[PDB]
Design an enzyme around this catalytic site. Structure first.
Site, PDB file in Angstrom:
ATOM      1  CG  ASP A  27       9.428   0.152   6.035  1.00 29.34           C
ATOM      2  OD1 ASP A  27       9.753  -0.796   7.090  1.00 29.34           O
ATOM      3  OD2 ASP A  27       9.094  -0.446   5.283  1.00 29.34           O
ATOM      4  CD  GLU A  72     -12.369  -1.351  13.124  1.00 30.41           C
ATOM      5  OE1 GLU A  72     -12.964  -2.342  12.108  1.00 30.41           O
ATOM      6  OE2 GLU A  72     -11.313  -0.268  13.195  1.00 30.41           O
ATOM      7  CB  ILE A 130      -1.013  -0.142   0.932  1.00 29.23           C
ATOM      8  CG1 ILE A 130      -1.673  -0.732   0.784  1.00 29.23           C
ATOM      9  CG2 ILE A 130      -1.352   1.551   1.531  1.00 29.23           C
ATOM     10  CD1 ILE A 130      -2.935  -1.033   1.971  1.00 29.23           C
ATOM     11  CG  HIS A 178     -11.725  -1.046   8.979  1.00 31.82           C
ATOM     12  ND1 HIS A 178     -11.497  -2.148   9.686  1.00 31.82           N
ATOM     13  CD2 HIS A 178     -10.964  -2.048   7.923  1.00 31.82           C
ATOM     14  CE1 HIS A 178     -10.526  -3.209   9.452  1.00 31.82           C
ATOM     15  NE2 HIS A 178     -10.644  -2.911   8.106  1.00 31.82           N
ATOM     16  CB  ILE A 179     -14.841   2.192   3.285  1.00 34.38           C
ATOM     17  CG1 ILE A 179     -14.345   3.690   4.126  1.00 34.38           C
ATOM     18  CG2 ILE A 179     -16.003   1.775   4.342  1.00 34.38           C
ATOM     19  CD1 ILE A 179     -14.961   4.650   3.048  1.00 34.38           C
ATOM     20  CB  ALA A 190      -6.683   3.957   5.867  1.00 36.77           C
TER      21      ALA A 190
END
Ligand SMILES: NC(=O)c1ccc[n+]([C@@H]2O[C@H](COP(=O)([O-])OP(=O)(O)OC[C@H]3O[C@@H](n4cnc5c(N)ncnc54)[C@H](O)[C@@H]3O)[C@@H](O)[C@H]2O)c1
Ligand SMILES: NC(=O)c1ccc[n+]([C@@H]2O[C@H](COP(=O)([O-])OP(=O)(O)OC[C@H]3O[C@@H](n4cnc5c(N)ncnc54)[C@H](O)[C@@H]3O)[C@@H](O)[C@H]2O)c1
Ligand SMILES: NC(=O)c1ccc[n+]([C@@H]2O[C@H](COP(=O)([O-])OP(=O)(O)OC[C@H]3O[C@@H](n4cnc5c(N)ncnc54)[C@H](O)[C@@H]3O)[C@@H](O)[C@H]2O)c1
Ligand SMILES: NC(=O)c1ccc[n+]([C@@H]2O[C@H](COP(=O)([O-])OP(=O)(O)OC[C@H]3O[C@@H](n4cnc5c(N)ncnc54)[C@H](O)[C@@H]3O)[C@@H](O)[C@H]2O)c1
Ligand SMILES: O=C(O)C(=O)COP(=O)(O)O
Ligand SMILES: O=C(O)C(=O)COP(=O)(O)O
Ligand SMILES: O=C(O)C(=O)COP(=O)(O)O
Ligand SMILES: O=C(O)C(=O)COP(=O)(O)O
Lengths: 429, 445, 431, 443
Positions: free
Chosen positions: A188, A276, A169, A307-308, A245
């Site tokens: 990272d 959630e 991602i 959470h889409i 996200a």
């Protein structure tokens, strides 16, 4: 110096073993079409089943496709007579007893990276939205308020995006973000080859100092748990933006809330939270679920999403293809590559012209002398090629044997079925 | 046979260079002292910095002035900077004694009587294309937002509702963007949209060279048939007025999206509202409306302003914005630079290029070593014999170069004359000021 | 009219040792190969030239791995004396210099570098296109003999010209990208329908390509179909003042047809890197009428670039050939990895972790006949087989097997038992 | 607060031009137009002139001073190249000459100062050859990198020398561009496309193209570059700027390419450097002394003392100044210049002129009936505009532009509401003026 060497830079045979596929939780149509086109009889359901209705159906089922809701425990899997493989048409597999499924010789498949693009696009959208305060503007006009504001509203071009976690991602986001004219720093824990003109940075603290937008794309680990908190927000620029996200645990919401209230963070977008709802519902997102919700929803320029990140027709479509294909290739060729609970094993397909060649798929207990037995049982035929790998207590042998007629299949099957170590056998002819 | 390749039409590149130019001569106004700039409607700081660095005395205001307080201030003002709110009519401009130029730190100039401003010899400047990038970015944002129903999702969770929905929510990659009007904004949007993995069709009334792998289409109807997202980037004309209406929405795909950050007249809102209610249009984003408030206010956007507001705000997946297309710090900053620079170059060099109401006239700067050279700026009525008079009055001096152009009733002459001492300036000024055709004169030495 | 629909789907390891290693390198193999082998402890013997069949047989007795190029011929005669030979490295494209069938039967894996030269051939062709387009060769030769001939007539910018690529393979496709970058239109004819790179366009007939191209370049293998495929009829189908470039194979162009076409002012120039007959060694007067009847006639023609098969003759190419092949041999010797072998079953297994103490890897090349695995898996029955892979290549077959819980004692035993087996062709144990 | 989010630093495709079709203006007098073209000007030039009605005389070669003077008497426009010398001697007989076209870079073959004083505008094509020189250098880089020249020469004499030693892929190598102008910058793009790193030294700070990097000192470029190419003008600073000390600063086995100017490289230094195995190869398109005509044995020790020594060296590409010697280059030179002359003749547009004031005005619409354009070249002395604007006082001047170039000056004026009657009058009055150097009226 001196001029030196520049740096180095046949139609396949259709195997036969009716096949019964049960699909739950509204698996995409792409999956349904793949299975039907192969002749399999498909049972579809938009929702899960209760433990009662399920056990009755899983008796005859050859392959089950589930998502995150349907829990497949030892209790419900023990009634599975003919079950060859399980398809998790989603990232998570926790809803399945892998250890048990393995011991019965059931291969489990999932789709870990099908949602990368969908999360990347969302973040571009959210960057622009926060940069311009779209959410606020649109809410104002809907309540009849006209608030034309350019103050501390930005073009994203010439701004710096800080990507925490440069994975599937993070890296897709990097390209899009450059395309939208953003400078891309990324921190990272692993040194990673940059895409385009992105720059890896040594410390998170450096990224937080130099970035205008900070977005997280990391898995859940003790290192990532509340990794963005008061000290991190204190290290970020005045009027910077936070986008998560990734995972519900990775951001300290009450720290963010204070930072926002202190005019330190100009806005944020959360797709994930520590707690959630289990289902879609009207009063689901409240102080009972997260103590701070009512305080959070009080703040300006905060985008909240349920959470889409991977909630798109594209994502679900490619999940349908990836997994349906995986099951099909396992069922048709015994290909177990990409399996999460199984030895990863495969062989080049056989030509149409290779008449009288059977493929032996022999899942067995990982103990000495098993191959001795099996290769003795097959000794009467030439083994073109075979592959056996082990995954802890279980192991999987694929073998292609030549010069077998309908007569000798029944015999070879029976002999292999009577073996000590056998957990399950299939013969593809 | 192997033949000469076709000559590159106009495909040459420009490597921009620090160009060692003979340092230019700094010209100063005659027959006047200190310069007065009045700035209204919260012009960006960039404008203020540029003006002060020229020596000008700057008066700044975050808001407009009433017609009373204004007339008192515009008496002494040499240059005024306004935006859309401040109206400069014949009424308030007739009191303008020393006014050299007007700066519209915005696109629109309707708030100024150009014809009149011209007749008094006042050059008006604006910033037409400073907002292109800001509108393009907004549309990318709105495309993704509508594609995923972000607005709705975030509103639900704010009211405590958790509605995780993937049904008819899309990745923009592999989708088609229909750009109606491939101008400054449309073309910038084209590049971004391809970068975000969209196919770009565009309909324009003019044939235009595509950027990247975008494809111009012959009919609007073709674009509407094949596009997933339709966005308008057209001016206000009788041809564009409600150009997207029932028939156009009927020609669009089931579950397509309409984005209008162009003009308030170009979309038929009640047709859009029908189309949305008929499940034909999956969502829309409007930045502009037929009627808009003149001021920020909490009850401003209502049925009194637009009959259909209360019906429009009832619809799902409709993003509404109060004309913020160009509402960014970047946009306002570059507007400040573009216009402040324009006024500065007009005041300091008489450069009227880019003026909306004036003859466009300029001359190459004079070298530092051209001592005793005066620049004559002579705005005059466009009638025969005026140059005869002027060039007669200057006859005692060599004219290095001059340029005169006409804009209807008015005309503008720039002339560089050599070998003039302090003595002869006062004389030449007076003689030119007494001329029949004179509308205004300035001498730069 | 339509509906918005879902978009289309997107387009430390354990160091194993055998239970000194001898590398022989001939024909001036790149230094990269030498360094790879030495760093692994192997004793390396290097030679800038080949060896005579006599001096070789004496050396190949003790050799564990030989690295050759095109000149050194490894026949049944010289390979039968190879006692310890594990693998052969062809530091070049061709393997015809090796008896593969025989090498296989003795359990010797052969490796090569087929596509290491792609970039080097592509660059050469860009160079040759510009050179022919401007007649550089001629201009420079004139001035060297004292003649000053400033000519713009039928000299071209390559930008806006059409390149015809016959054979859109590894080289053809790399050439396509560079050629577009240099502003050339790229047509390509292939016998297979292939996905274009950049904005290149596939054409149905060679005849169409020859009609519409300014520069024609061949990038095809040697087959009966390609043999003299460019001849009088093809040159007749090409544009007046077009150019022919062949860095493919020596057989693919009919030189005497080309010579006539050039003499007839039909072809403006050509560049050949390959010929039907080529010298076996570098030498003066090697390229003559004895080698090719037409040489003296060919070298008489203007704007013809001739090169002695240098398409892949760069430090880069030789360097990466050295790495590719040296690596291949090393991974075969150290892990039994036979993937990319030209004469062998392709077989490999994931490396073992450092933590997997007391695990031996059985490498068992054997005759491809029934009952062999029965025997082998019987012989190993005392130990758990973590994983194993067996594949067959006609008469021969190769089994890799990882077995756990073996001490120094049991290795010697397992080796001996496997060595005594009926089907055995060769055995190695990695411990 | 490490910092704060702040305003980013402040920074249209081609469309079918929807303008009111322009009025084609024709000269008063100049009944028929005479174009003389020498030295084999490209056909593109010939086509442009003929299509405008002009009568065109073409010649593949120059003319002798005798045959020329006889022809330039009646000529309205002459097109030459580098050979034809247009001196005061031959230009003084030019009765009707409006403009000179130099279908080439150089203008030294023309007396500009004199041509100016007679009111003759001179035009040239300075940058028409950029692409052709850039392509040549890519070719030469690859050729030197692989020693193509040598290989092909060997095989032609029957020698087969298959060599990969010190032969390179250009990818991953560094190109040092000395002078990042029209050619240098085009070369930069191509060189990156061919996978080369591009350093460039210039005396002026210039915006890099692609991912090229400007360097502070020539010495840095010479240290870090594998291929050094010069793309600089001829100046005292560039004269022998690459000599022993520079070659000493370059990498072992580096390459020198000069398609700039014959003076910029010290050949005997290069020759020593090559002989000392310091420079692996070079390609020269230009030399201190070059033949004036194509000939056999023209390139010899009489022309340059070192030729016989230079041609003795391996991997040295020598070319007879062919950098811009392509059909493309000559074609676009023909268009650029023919167009320039046409626009000067038809509209009085003197922009791009090398000896003249640069002056132009927007074209007039078809609808602007009865508008004459006054082209008045005159002596740059006071009171001339006074006279002219007095003479035109009877008509409205829509727009006029006057600029000066030393002793001479040029006035363009558009005047409205003139009938055939008043043209003859205005022309005569302007022709009789004291300062007049030449007059043309376009209606
Ligand atoms: N919101 C959604 O609907 C949605 C959808 C798909 C994936 N995701 C989740 O988003 C996250 C990113 O997914 P992905 O596929 O890109 O992950 P990935 O495993 O491919 O990449 C994660 C990267 O983070 C790095 N990383 C790990 N711990 C780190 C730390 N403490 N500090 C810095 N870097 C660290 C890793 O080195 C790796 O490069 C995952 O948690 C994934 O499950 C969310
Ligand atoms: N929302 C905002 O705050 C905001 C900000 C800036 C500009 N704008 C407006 O957006 C529009 C686009 O601005 P721009 O500067 O890019 O304009 P532009 O002049 O550069 O582009 C207009 C384009 O539309 C084409 N066109 C004209 N009439 C047409 C028609 N009837 N149908 C189709 N194409 C037609 C023109 O040929 C041209 O290509 C303008 O109306 C401008 O005022 C809005
Ligand atoms: N000159 C040198 O030093 C040198 C170096 C390396 C390779 N090569 C040779 O160059 C050639 C191309 O190399 P590659 O690695 O790109 O090859 P490749 O195998 O990748 O591609 C060859 C292509 O030609 C096509 N083809 C085959 N027969 C054809 C025919 N009759 N007409 C048209 N197309 C046909 C094939 O379909 C294929 O696409 C080979 O012969 C190779 O050995 C030369
Ligand atoms: N071989 C041919 O046939 C041929 C053809 C065209 C041009 N040329 C010549 O090659 C050169 C390139 O022409 P161009 O159009 O690119 O020129 P240009 O004017 O566009 O660029 C020349 C560059 O050199 C730089 N420069 C000047 N003096 C310098 C110095 N001493 N050191 C470093 N940089 C310096 C300038 O800043 C400029 O960037 C010119 O001399 C031109 O006459 C040769
Ligand atoms: O795809 C994911 O991220 C999940 O595991 C969520 O499961 P679901 O597909 O929403 O039932
Ligand atoms: O915002 C712009 O740029 C305009 O064109 C008009 O807006 P304003 O007058 O600056 O509020
Ligand atoms: O096959 C090749 O790569 C060749 O060029 C011929 O063999 P070589 O490597 O030169 O010995
Ligand atoms: O380099 C140049 O273009 C020249 O000045 C040479 O003139 P030419 O066009 O060869 O007559």
């Amino acid at each position: 110096g001196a001029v030196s060497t520049s740096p180095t830079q046949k139609q396949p045979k259709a195997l036969k073993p009716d096949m019964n596929i049960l699909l739950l939780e509204n698996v995409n149509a792409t999956a349904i079409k793949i299975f039907k086109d192969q002749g399999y009889q498909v049972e579809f359901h938009k929702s899960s089943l209760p433990e009662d209705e399920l056990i009755e159906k899983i008796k005859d089922v050859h392959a089950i496709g589930i998502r995150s809701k349907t829990r497949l425990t030892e209790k419900i899997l023990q009634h599975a007579r003919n079950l060859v493989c399980i398809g998790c048409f989603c990232i998570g597999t926790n809803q399945v007893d892998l250890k048990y499924a393995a011991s019965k010789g059931i291969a489990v498949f999932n789709s870990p990276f099908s949602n990368s693009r969908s999360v990347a696009e969302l973040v571009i959208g959210e960057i622009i939205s926060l940069a311009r305060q779209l959410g606020d503007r649109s809410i104002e006009l809907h309540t009849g308020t006209w608030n034309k504001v350019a103050a501390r509203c930005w073009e994203v071009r010439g701004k710096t995006l800080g990507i925490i976690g440069y994975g599937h991602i993070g890296s897709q986001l990097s390209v899009l973000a450059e395309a939208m004219g953003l400078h891309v720093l990324y921190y990272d824990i692993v040194t990673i080859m940059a895409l385009g003109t992105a720059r890896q940075v040594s410390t998170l603290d450096e990224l937080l100092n130099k970035s205008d937008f900070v977005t997280l794309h990391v898995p859940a680990t003790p290192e990532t748990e509340k990794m963005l908190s008061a000290p991190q927000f204190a290290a970020m620029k005045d009027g910077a933006y936070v986008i998560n996200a990734s995972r519900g645990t990775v951001v300290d919401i009450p720290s963010l809330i204070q930072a926002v209230k202190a005019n330190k963070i100009a806005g944020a977008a959360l797709d994930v939270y520590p707690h959630e709802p289990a289902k879609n519902g009207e009063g689901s997102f409240n102080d009972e679920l997260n103590s701070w919700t009512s305080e959070l929803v009080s703040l300006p320029n905060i985008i909240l999403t349920p959470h889409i990140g991977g909630s798109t027709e594209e994502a679900q479509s490619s999940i349908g293809i990836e997994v349906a294909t995986a099951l099909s290739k396992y069922i048709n060729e015994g290909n177990s590559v990409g399996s999460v609970n199984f030895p990863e094993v495969s062989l080049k397909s056989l030509d149409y012209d290779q008449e009288n060649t059977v493929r032996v798929l022999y899942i067995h207990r990982n103990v000495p002398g098993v191959l001795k037995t099996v290769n003795d049982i097959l000794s009467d035929h030439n083994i073109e090629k075979q592959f056996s790998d082990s995954h802890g207590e279980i192991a999987y042998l694929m073998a292609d044997i030549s010069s077998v007629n309908q007569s000798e299949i029944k015999d070879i099957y029976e002999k292999l079925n009577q073996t000590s170590a056998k957990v399950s056998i299939r013969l593809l002819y």
